[model samples]
Target: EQCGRQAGGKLCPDNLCCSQWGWCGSTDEYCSPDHNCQSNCKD
Candidate 1:
C-alpha cells in the first residue's frame, strides 16, 4: 500500500517501509535508514 505522513498519514504494515516517494516496500530503496525512508522502516 501507499504510505507516508503526507500520503493520507497511512502508516505501513507488517514491517513495510514508507519510502521518501510515498510508497510502501521492503527493499533498500525504502528500508535503508541512510536512504531516508519516510517512516516505518524495519531492520
Candidate 2:
C-alpha cells in the first residue's frame, strides 16, 4: 500500500478513505477505527 502525508493531515487514494492513523485503505478495517473516516469509500 502507498502512504504519504497531506497538507491537510489526512490523505487517501482517489477512491479510498483516509483512516485515523493516516493510512489509505478500504473496508471497516480502515474506516471503523477512525471517527473522521471519509464518506467516499467503496463498498
Candidate 3:
C-alpha cells in the first residue's frame, strides 16, 4: 500500500505534488488516480 501522511495539514516538498492520501511526491504515484492534488509545494 502507499505510505504517507493523511491529506490536509501536511505540506508537500518543493516541485512535488500532494497525493489524495496526503503523501508528498512528484510522479503519478502522487499526482494521479485521485482528485485532491494541490499546489504551492515547499522545501
lDDT top scorer: 1
Query: In model 3, where do residues sit more than 4 Å from their true spots?
Result: 1-7, 33-36, 40-43
C-alpha lDDT (0 to 100) for residue 36 of candidate 2? 55
Report the CA-based lDDT of candidate 3 relative to the real structure: 0.56
Q: What is the C-alpha lDDT of each candidate?
A: 0.81, 0.55, 0.56
Cα deviation of 24, candidate 3, in Å? 0.4
**Candidate 3, position 7, lDDT:** 44
The RMSD (Cα, Å) of candidate 1 is 2.1
Which portions of model 2 show Cα errors greater than 4 Å? Answer: 1-7, 33-43
Q: Report how far residue 5 has shifted in candidate 3, in Å.
A: 9.5
What's model 2's overall lDDT?
0.55
Indicate whether candidate 1 or candidate 2 has the larger lDDT. Answer: 1
Model 3 pairs in collision: 14-42
**Preferred candidate (lDDT higher): 1 or 3:** 1
Query: What would the TM-score be for candidate 3 when compared with the true structure?
Result: 0.45
For residues 7-42, write the lDDT of model 2, one tens digit per residue: 355456676776655677777856663455544443
Clashing pairs in 2: none
lDDT at 26, model 2: 75
Q: Write the per-residue lDDT of candidate 3 for residues 1-43, one digit (tens) a residue.
A: 1323554455665656777666678776566655555543333
RMSD (Å) of each candidate, 1 decimal: 2.1, 4.5, 5.7
